[PDB]
């Protein structure tokens, strides 16, 4: 203004200058410092550059009522309104009033006496808190990539251009030119490319020296009543105080973390209320604070120091995945981290009540690797100190690892260590009589979907350690978990389902900025069922975390039901953002049913939540809606679903809310149970439903999760049967194809008898030479048949990868190349989708196999009794595999034989190899019985023919 400049849109430059940060951020920020300003409206011109909030600063006028005019400008209705922000200045004043010229200046303090109000110190302290201060990987490749690509110019090619002057005519003037606007892009340019580290690696207050002096005047209610407060989001306030961060580095976190540090420092002094409001809130907050630091750090030591926990050694499976997280990179960092980070071992150090910790210690195996690690091992030993309880125990122990989040990817080596017990696996195989525990795999399959989209495929590799597999049997399919929900089934009425849903809400403790449902969690605390929580108040771990935290209730009105009509198509979410279509659901949700406001209680807190999370209950909503709808949605939903039915119909698009769409139908199939109470509740379900599964099946057919689909089909069938009953009553058309599609779903079943229920080499290489002259694998499967390193000449999938790795077994690199295949496998493994059925064995084969093929590498590496032991292993595996589908089995030791085939070949150096190979043929011999067991004619022939060709061309003992 004084140089009057910015009107040039030097602001725009300043705006451009802002391009570091988001809009008018410092404009906000230093408007704090604005108060330095004959500016009375005059600084504010800079708001032209930049008319509300800072009148709090205008309390500096109180430091007067021209503001009231300046208010009255906007309005004076605020006469108290924001004064907290000033009350912070008043805190600052109180600070000046507390413990200097400002201190001298403190006398204005009586100024409030326009107000008597000090009770509003009720809501207080946020800024009283907030007020501290004013009170290499790019270098990887010399090799072909930067040859294929180029490499970054560094040397004098940088300096190459330094010869200049003449043409800068343009240049120098271009600089003079709109570079006068443009050039600061230079000033703006530098910003980029560090991973710094600095976050940890890179005199605010001693309002610290002032810290509690009010609470001193106030009798430590900042402890005490601010304890009695619940301090509740006053905690979460801190998070908000963080939340702003963009560059927190020289920006907030340095203060802001220090704030957390102070918040810790706040949290620090805690004696009673620390748990005794909630450490639970507190800890997971620190956990989040960690999780932030995790997401991120230097003061995370304080976050460590939070392990102070002396009575708070009551820290718990609270502390578990936290600890579990707490590991994760801690050493991998600059050991300055480790310098403390061993505090985990300080954490480790006292066994008392660490049994769970021990029980939970599992990944400390990964903590037992690169450290120390030995201590971790020693801890893991101290963990394992009980008894290497194994077979399922480790498995259970392995099963016991779910306490954490996704990526831990840590200790899984024991999965490899399984084979070391794999006799116990036979012993494990002893388990046959029951319905479970092959899911120990599914536990991997769980891990398989677990963390799936995220980084570090080397996690997905651990399926290799998990790969020894695929004899499992005796069911179709998958399962759910968490009898807590059954413990929740202890609940009764869908307020319970809400109370249950509320768990999912409580199940949001979770992460940034969505914290709003705390108020909803408060809104939860509304009496509605609320004693349902008091009803719930007996058992639960999770509850107290909330019970400590949250906890006279409120209604809402409604008018037009049909006003919700247009959603389902729109909520069909033709475009992306199912969340939007869910926002439309959320709109359908925001469309306010008197079924539950208790639902609507969070609807906004819901609205910004994870859609599906809401959208899940959208079903539960829809059911309440269904429960509500007289004909209303009953009519309305009917087509609305029929829309969702049509939603993908005729090559239209439904996915990933498609299930979510079906999920409604699911909770329709499911949560509808008494809805329109009916003898087939199927009828009732159909009644609760939009009444045609015939589509829903096809919809499910798209959903393609068969059993339900099949059932839903069977329902659609039953619907057709109902329709047939209706046809009776009348007293892919006809859908036997749909039924065949269902048989194809029964094919999608992949249980062969059910499929039957649904039913109710070189010459190949020659044949392939035509192909050689869907393919590579077929070729390489034929290479997996024929002489890989040899018939690799036919390369002029996994099979190929295998054949390649088989070729890569020409040697060495295969060990890596395997990993690639193993990855390619692990990918193929990851390529698993829908997890409902058999052929996970067909999946797990090379998994169950190639690792052996991998394990074979010792042959390329390195008495031969190992080979026997491996044959024995293969045999043991075979025994393990003994009962199986030869169809499944088909490649497997065949591969091994194929593996053996050349394995013996370059091994013809050793005569024992031939004998081993003979024993391997003798191993391969068993195939015949298996082939007989297969009762597969084409199968047995080559073997002896091979055997005849093979070292059983020796043919001495005729066995």
What Rg do the C-alpha atoms of the chain give, in angstroms?
Answer: 35
308 close to 265: Cβ distance less than 8 angstroms: no
Q: Determine the Cα–Cα distance for residues 465 and 822; give it in Å rounded to an integer.
A: 11
Instruction: Name residues whose C-beta falls within 8 Å of residue 260's C-beta, 6 or more positions apart in sequence.
Output: 238, 242, 289, 299, 302, 303
467 CB-contact burial (10 Å; exposed 0-12 / middle 13-18 / buried 19+): buried
Other beta carbons within 10 angstroms of residue 491's beta carbon come to 19
Q: Determine the Cα–Cα distance for residues 426 and 881; give it in Å rounded to an integer.
A: 10
647 close to 572: Cβ distance less than 8 angstroms: yes
Dihedral-angle region of residue 786 (phi above 0 means left; psi in -120 to 50 means alpha; beta otherwise):
beta
Angle, CA 715 vertex, CA 665 and CA 627 arms, to 5°: 40
Instruction: Name residues whose C-beta falls within 8 Å of residue 804's C-beta, 6 or more positions apart in sequence.
Output: 780, 792, 795, 817, 821
455 close to 329: Cβ distance less than 8 angstroms: no
With tokens 């001193």, the residue in question is: 216
Instruction: Name residues whose C-beta falls within 8 Å of residue 493's C-beta, 6 or more positions apart in sequence.
Output: 529
Angle, CA 666 vertex, CA 661 and CA 667 arms, to 5°: 105
Q: Determine the Cα–Cα distance for residues 885 and 930; give it in Å rounded to an integer.
A: 10
Q: Determine the Cα–Cα distance for residues 729 and 709; give it in Å rounded to an integer.
A: 26
Q: Which two tokens stand for residue 679?
A: 């003898």
Pairs from 938-945 (Cβ < 8 Å, separation ≥ 24): 939/886, 939/890, 942/761, 943/897
CA–CA distance from 919 to each of 748, 868, 950 (Å)? 40, 8, 12
CA–CA distance from 857 to each of 460, 468, 475 (Å)? 21, 16, 35
Nearest to 764 by CA among 782, 777, 776, 780: 782
Nearest to 855 by CA among 843, 866, 841, 863: 866
Nearest to 805 by CA among 899, 905, 888, 894: 899
CA–CA distance from 719 to each of 636, 660, 676, 680 (Å)? 20, 22, 16, 11
DSSP string of 287-310? HHHHHHHHH--TTHHHHHHGGG-S
With tokens 């998958």, the residue in question is: 478
55 close to 71: Cβ distance less than 8 angstroms: yes
Torsion of CA 714, 720, 721, 724, to 10 degrees: -170
282 CB-contact burial (10 Å; exposed 0-12 / middle 13-18 / buried 19+): buried
Q: Determine the Cα–Cα distance for residues 589 and 505; give it in Å rounded to an integer.
A: 16
898 close to 809: Cβ distance less than 8 angstroms: no
The alpha-helical segments, DSSP class H, found in 177-251 are 179-182, 184-189, 213-218, 224-228, 232-243
Instruction: Name residues whose C-beta falls within 8 Å of residue 221's C-beta, 6 or more positions apart in sequence.
Output: 215, 227, 228
| Distance linking the first and last C-alpha atoms of the chain | 104
With tokens 């927190």, the residue in question is: 248
With tokens 């108020």, the residue in question is: 519
Q: Determine the Cα–Cα distance for residues 433 and 124; give it in Å rounded to an integer.
A: 64
Q: Which two tokens stand for residue 846?
A: 């090379």
DSSP string of 98-146? T--HHHHHGGGGGGGGG----GGGGG--HHHHHTTTT--GGG--SSHHH
What method was applied to determine this entry?
cryo-EM
Other beta carbons within 10 angstroms of residue 881's beta carbon come to 23
777 close to 797: Cβ distance less than 8 angstroms: yes
Nearest to 549 by CA among 516, 515, 522, 514: 522
The alpha-helical segments, DSSP class H, found in 591-692 are 597-600, 603-607, 611-628, 632-647, 658-669, 681-688
Experimental structure resolution, Å:
5.7
Q: Determine the Cα–Cα distance for residues 99 and 213; give it in Å rounded to an integer.
A: 7
CA 32, 33, 38, 42 torsion: positive or negative? negative
600 close to 517: Cβ distance less than 8 angstroms: no
């Amino acid at each position: 203004p004084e140089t009057l400049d910015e009107i040039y849109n030097r602001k725009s430059v300043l705006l451009t200058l802002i391009a570091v940060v988001l809009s008018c951020s410092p404009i906000c920020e230093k408007q704090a410092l604005f108060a330095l300003c004959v500016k009375k409206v005059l600084e504010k011109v800079s708001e032209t550059f930049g008319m509300a909030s800072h009148l709090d600063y205008l309390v500096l006028e109180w430091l007067f009522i021209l503001l009231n005019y300046t208010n009255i400008e906007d309005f004076y209705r605020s006469c108290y309104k924001v004064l907290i922000p000033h009350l912070v200045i008043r805190s600052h004043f109180d600070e000046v009033k507390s413990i200097q010229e400002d201190w001298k200046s403190l006398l204005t303090d009586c100024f409030p006496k326009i107000l008597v109000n000090i009770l509003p110190y009720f809501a207080y302290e946020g800024t009283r808190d907030s007020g501290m201060a004013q009170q290499h990987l790019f270098i990887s490749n010399l090799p072909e990539i930067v040859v294929e690509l180029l490499m970054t110019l560094h040397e004098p090619a940088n300096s190459s251009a330094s010869q200049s002057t003449d043409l800068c005519d343009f240049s120098g003037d271009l600089d003079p030119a709109p570079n006068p606007p443009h050039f600061p892009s230079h000033v703006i340019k530098a910003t980029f490319a560090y991973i710094s580290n600095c976050h940890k690696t890179k005199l605010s207050k001693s309002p610290d020296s002032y810290q509690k002096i009010l609470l001193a005047i106030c009798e430590q209610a900042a402890e005490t009543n601010n304890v009695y407060k619940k301090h509740r989001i006053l905690k979460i306030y801190h998070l908000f105080v963080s939340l702003l961060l963009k560059d927190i580095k020289s920006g907030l976190g340095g203060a802001w973390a220090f704030v957390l540090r102070d918040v810790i420092y706040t949290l620090i002094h805690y004696i009673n209320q620390r748990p005794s409001c909630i450490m639970d809130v507190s800890l997971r907050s620190f956990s989040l604070c960690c999780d932030l630091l995790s997401q991120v750090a230097l003061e995370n030591h304080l976050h460590v120091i939070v392990g102070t926990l002396i009575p708070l050694v009551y820290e718990q499976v609270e502390v578990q995945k936290q600890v579990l997280d707490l590991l994760k990179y801690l050493v991998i960092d600059n050991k300055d981290n480790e310098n403390l980070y061993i505090t985990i071992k300080l954490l480790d150090p006292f066994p008392d009540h660490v049994v769970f910790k021990d029980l939970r210690i599992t990944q400390q195996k990964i903590k037992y690797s690169r450290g120390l690690e030995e201590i971790n091992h020693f801890l893991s030993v101290s963990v394992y100190d009980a008894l290497p309880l194994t077979r399922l125990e480790g498995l259970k122990d392995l099963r016991r690892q779910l306490e954490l989040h996704k990526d831990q990817m840590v200790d899984i080596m024991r999965a490899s260590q399984d084979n070391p017990q794999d006799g116990i696996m036979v012993k494990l195989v002893v388990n046959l009589l029951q319905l479970s525990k092959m899911a120990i795999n599914h536990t991997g399959e769980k891990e398989v979907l677990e963390a799936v989209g995220s980084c570090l495929g080397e996690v997905g590799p651990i399926d290799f350690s998990t790969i020894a597999i695929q004899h499992s049997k005796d069911a179709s399919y998958t399962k759910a978990l968490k009898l807590f929900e059954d413990k929740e089934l202890q609940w009764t009425f869908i307020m319970l389902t809400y109370l249950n849903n509320t768990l999912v809400e409580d199940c949001v403790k979770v992460r940034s900025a969505a914290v709003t449902c705390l108020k909803n969690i408060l809104a939860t605390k509304t009496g509605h069922s609320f004693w349902e929580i008091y009803k719930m108040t007996t058992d639960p771990m999770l509850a107290y975390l909330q019970p400590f935290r949250t906890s006279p209730l409120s209604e809402n009105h409604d008018i037009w039901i049909k006003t919700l009509t247009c959603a389902f198509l729109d909520s069909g979410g033709t475009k992306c953002e199912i969340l939007q279509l869910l926002k439309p659901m959320c709109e359908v949700k925001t469309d306010f049913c008197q079924t539950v406001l208790p639902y609507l209680i969070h609807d906004i807190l819901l609205q910004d939540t994870n859609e599906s999370w809401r959208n899940l209950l959208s079903t539960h909503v829809q059911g309440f809606f269904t429960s509500c709808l007289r004909h209303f949605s009953q009519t309305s939903r009917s087509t609305t679903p029929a829309n969702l039915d049509s939603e993908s119909e005729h090559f239209f698009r439904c996915c990933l809310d498609k299930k979510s769409q079906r999920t409604m139908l699911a909770v329709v199939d499911y949560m509808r149970r008494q809805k329109r109470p009916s003898s087939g509740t199927i009828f009732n379900d159909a009644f609760w439903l939009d009444l045609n599964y015939l589509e829903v099946a096809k919809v499910a057919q798209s959903c393609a999760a068969h059993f339900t689909a099949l059932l839903y089909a069977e329902i659609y069938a039953d619907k057709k049967s109902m329709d047939d009953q209706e046809k009776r009553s009348l007293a892919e058309e006809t859908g036997i194809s749909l039924q065949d599609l269902l048989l194809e779903i029964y094919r999608s079943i992949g249980e062969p008898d059910s499929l039957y229920g649904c039913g109710g080499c070189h010459i190949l290489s020659v044949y392939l030479k035509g192909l050689d002259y869907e393919l590579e694998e077929l070729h390489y499967q034929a290479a997996w048949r024929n002489m890989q390193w040899d018939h690799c000449t036919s390369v002029s999938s996994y099979h190929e990868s295998l054949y390649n790795a088989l070729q890569s077994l020409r040697d060495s690199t295969f060990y890596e190349s395997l990993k690639y295949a193993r990855v390619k496998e692990v990918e193929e493994m990851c390529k698993r989708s829908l997890e409902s059925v058999y052929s996970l064995y067909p999946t797990l084969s090379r998994l169950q196999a190639i690792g052996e093929l991998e394990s074979i590498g010792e042959l390329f590496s390195r008495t031969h009794r190992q080979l026997s032991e491996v044959y024995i292993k293969w045999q043991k595996h075979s025994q393990l595999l003994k009962d199986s589908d030869f169809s499944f089995q088909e490649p497997i030791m065949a591969l091994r034989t194929v593996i053996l085939e050349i394995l013996m070949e370059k091994e013809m150096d050793n005569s024992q190899r031939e004998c081993i190979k003979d024993i391997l043929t003798k191993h391969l011999v068993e195939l015949s019985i298996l082939a007989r067991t297969f009762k597969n004619t084409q199968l047995p022939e080559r073997a002896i023919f091979q055997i005849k060709q093979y070292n059983s061309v020796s043919c001495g003992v005729s066995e």
